[PDB]
Design a binder for this molecule. Sequence first.
Ligand SMILES: Cc1cc2nc3c(=O)[nH]c(=O)nc-3n(C[C@H](O)[C@H](O)[C@H](O)COP(=O)(O)OP(=O)(O)OC[C@H]3O[C@@H](n4cnc5c(N)ncnc54)[C@H](O)[C@@H]3O)c2cc1C
Ligand SMILES: Cc1cc2nc3c(=O)[nH]c(=O)nc-3n(C[C@H](O)[C@H](O)[C@H](O)COP(=O)(O)O)c2cc1C
Length: 613
Amino acid sequence: ESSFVEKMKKTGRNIIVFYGSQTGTAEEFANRLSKDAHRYGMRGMSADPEEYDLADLSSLPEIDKSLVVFCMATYGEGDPTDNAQDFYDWLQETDVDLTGVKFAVFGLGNKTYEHFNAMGKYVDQRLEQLGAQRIFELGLGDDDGNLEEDFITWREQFWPAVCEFFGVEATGEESSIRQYELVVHEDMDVAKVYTGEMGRLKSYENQKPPFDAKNPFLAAVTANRKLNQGTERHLMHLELDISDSKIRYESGDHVAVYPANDSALVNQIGEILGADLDVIMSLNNLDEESNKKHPFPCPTTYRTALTYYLDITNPPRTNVLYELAQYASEPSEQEHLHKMASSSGEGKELYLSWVVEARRHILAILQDYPSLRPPIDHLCELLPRLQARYYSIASSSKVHPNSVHICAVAVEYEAKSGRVNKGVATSWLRAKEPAGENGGRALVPMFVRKSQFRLPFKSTTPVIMVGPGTGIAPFMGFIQERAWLREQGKEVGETLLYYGCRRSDEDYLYREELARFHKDGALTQLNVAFSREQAHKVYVQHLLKRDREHLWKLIHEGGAHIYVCGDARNMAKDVQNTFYDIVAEFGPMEHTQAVDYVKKLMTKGRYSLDVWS
Ligand SMILES: Cc1cc2nc3c(=O)[nH]c(=O)nc-3n(C[C@H](O)[C@H](O)[C@H](O)COP(=O)(O)OP(=O)(O)OC[C@H]3O[C@@H](n4cnc5c(N)ncnc54)[C@H](O)[C@@H]3O)c2cc1C
Ligand SMILES: Cc1cc2nc3c(=O)[nH]c(=O)nc-3n(C[C@H](O)[C@H](O)[C@H](O)COP(=O)(O)O)c2cc1C
């Protein structure tokens, strides 16, 4: 049962697509590949590599006309994902030989980091070295531009390749097989019906420790406020009560929240679809010998599925539109939906400029294409899961640990579709009234994630903190940690803040807080780079360059640690370049030597990054 080659033997399937997903994209890609395998006379399913050992690749060739496909991503400095760590270290430690096995590898990654599909290349090269056989070239899938484009091109070029390598036919077209079947329930008590729980049944009522991604803890929003004095952007501050929850964290860590989707969106989707949203149901996988029982845990109603378990806000993938094409009554709209999932042609640019660029969700695509009324169960089938959203902690463990803090920006923009598009978690927390009073709490589920973004072990070490926008939250955690250390008697070295904002009267975050921090000596020097008040634009890297004379001496003698967090599009790169210039000009040192010195700094942990984009 544990081994999956036996499951191949019983199910009669031959092609496997592995996924190393954490945010769901690789899982969906593997599921799509396994579904598409039926179109070419073959049968297979996508299986998660965590519950299955990889020693079964030796027994894999025992299946005639077999194949295995890998769709893996990576995080950090080329580190494996949580599910793929066992695969990675087994690959590291393995010494067996795999002769006659056939494989393919698709890589998921981002161009902005140096380890660009590190895991895909590593798996391909390790399989080749170990003695396996390549069939199709590696997929250089980059998330910097469009990721669906690369995968669709790789699939369109790969299926004919394996088809000609194996000699099978491809007569069948537009099969569009289903993966789950509807099971309605008429009389079923709410005791065994999910009402928003992620893991155990009825978890949201009587929680037990520990609490993590699978079993979040609902915190109570004690208070919140609008930090910025302007009105163009709603920069908000949250305080979540963590009393008696046993959650132990540290400053600079990450708090993750499971949002609830907009009720208006679900109501409008149900109204336009014309279905009873309060129908208790279930979706059962046809392949019984699969660990994915349902796309979301069931039984549950339609309303719960579209509120707490589905993602109806981000643009749909090409496979969803292709699977929904046949439900379009009007031939032209059906043809548009069919060609939307192509590899080139005018339909490709139409998809690019109509779904992703215009940011059209499922409701928008339904409204703009009125001759399209797909069944609600099919829409719940196709749509991806709802992903948790993570925020940096603005509190400290050595200071009040009973509550965590969140600095967030309310997402609101005028999408090119002409529709007001609203963020899920930011606006969900924005609508969370502090309440309190008699019994209202406005509960919010959450769990904490550990990270390496930490203060130095000894308080004597100077700390340099640079980040604009909402990046001040871990910096504030560090600041009040240092303030607590100073007020506790122990001396604390130099602490520097390098912050940026547009205007002092528009989005200056925590004027009073950092004012008192500087006036009390906790923050030795505050440095704020206004971005719109003066005629030109002065950013944080300008302040770094201007303080270079102190910064170089601090790094050389005090062993100061560098912390950077915020947006990664331009800020991190220019901060890196400024640090290169400062460490090279004051060496004197060459560019390559300065880069090597900075990498050596990172290897010791004195340089840290907590960027996000
Ligand atoms: C490690 C990590 C740490 C983070 N820390 C923080 C933190 O400390 N504070 C914080 O506020 N957030 C933080 N985030 C971001 C947070 O997790 C969410 O991504 C963010 O709050 C987006 O809002 P949402 O949750 O509603 O997402 P969504 O509703 O998915 O909205 C975001 C989506 O909308 C798009 N979008 C947004 N604005 C526009 C626009 N003007 N034009 C076009 N597209 C647009 C984005 O590209 C993205 O696709 C962090 C993320 C990570 C991964
Ligand atoms: C926190 C974070 C770290 C990442 N690190 C890497 C990386 O080290 N190398 C890389 O190629 N891509 C990296 N990426 C990009 C992801 O690989 C890319 O978004 C991919 O589509 C994610 O696949 P998934 O949805 O299956 O998790 C990172 C993305 C995030 C959010």
